[PDB]
Ligand SMILES: Cn1ccc(C(=O)NC[C@@H]2CCCO2)n1
Ligand SMILES: Cn1ccc(C(=O)NC[C@@H]2CCCO2)n1
Ligand SMILES: Cn1ccc(C(=O)NC[C@@H]2CCCO2)n1
């Protein structure tokens with residue numbers, strides 16, 4: 001029904017929000033520290049000097065294990 | 070249809086996986102460092118000396134800003 005299409009769209013949008021903002025292909029699993037923005041996969045987070053969201057200096061990257069993974 | 074019910078169940082399970090594993094009421098927004106398990110809201114994470122998934126000592130809690138929030 002039309003309700004099935006509405007739920008499919010909500011599911012798709014939630015799943016897309018869990019994907020890396022740089023490559024759009026891999027799951028987010030890395031946090032820029034200390035700012036806390038958690039928006040990249042490990043490969044994309046590895047060479048960034050500053051956060052792509054807030055421009056804060058990246059002191060290090062923390063790997064995250066999420067129950068949605 | 071029956072697919073509306075199946076999609077409603079998938080959406081609910083994905084949303085539940087984003088909720089704190091301890092209080093079951095607030096969104097996950099905190100990482101236990103250094104292990105990386107990201108399973109709690111800030112209130113439950115502040116009260117735990119050991120990670121509830123792997124039992125490693127919590128050296129500190131990193132707040133995470135996620136696009137799914
Ligand atoms: C971050 N974001 C939003 C939407 C998408 C997306 O549709 N990406 C396409 C690829 C194809 C294989 C994995 O997703 N990514
Ligand atoms: C008979 N039954 C048991 C569970 C459901 C169900 O989840 N229905 C889908 C709902 C209706 C509102 C849109 O999603 N139906
Ligand atoms: C972690 N988790 C799994 C399922 C649930 C759950 O159903 N929680 C109930 C509360 C009521 C207000 C917010 O969710 N939580």
Ligand SMILES: [Zn+2]
Nearest residue numbers: 020023041044
């Ligand atoms: Zn990436």
Ligand SMILES: [Zn+2]
Nearest residue numbers: 035037051054
């Ligand atoms: Zn940032």
Ligand SMILES: [Zn+2]
Nearest residue numbers: 089092110113
């Ligand atoms: Zn909690």
Ligand SMILES: [Zn+2]
Nearest residue numbers: 104106120123
């Ligand atoms: Zn742990």
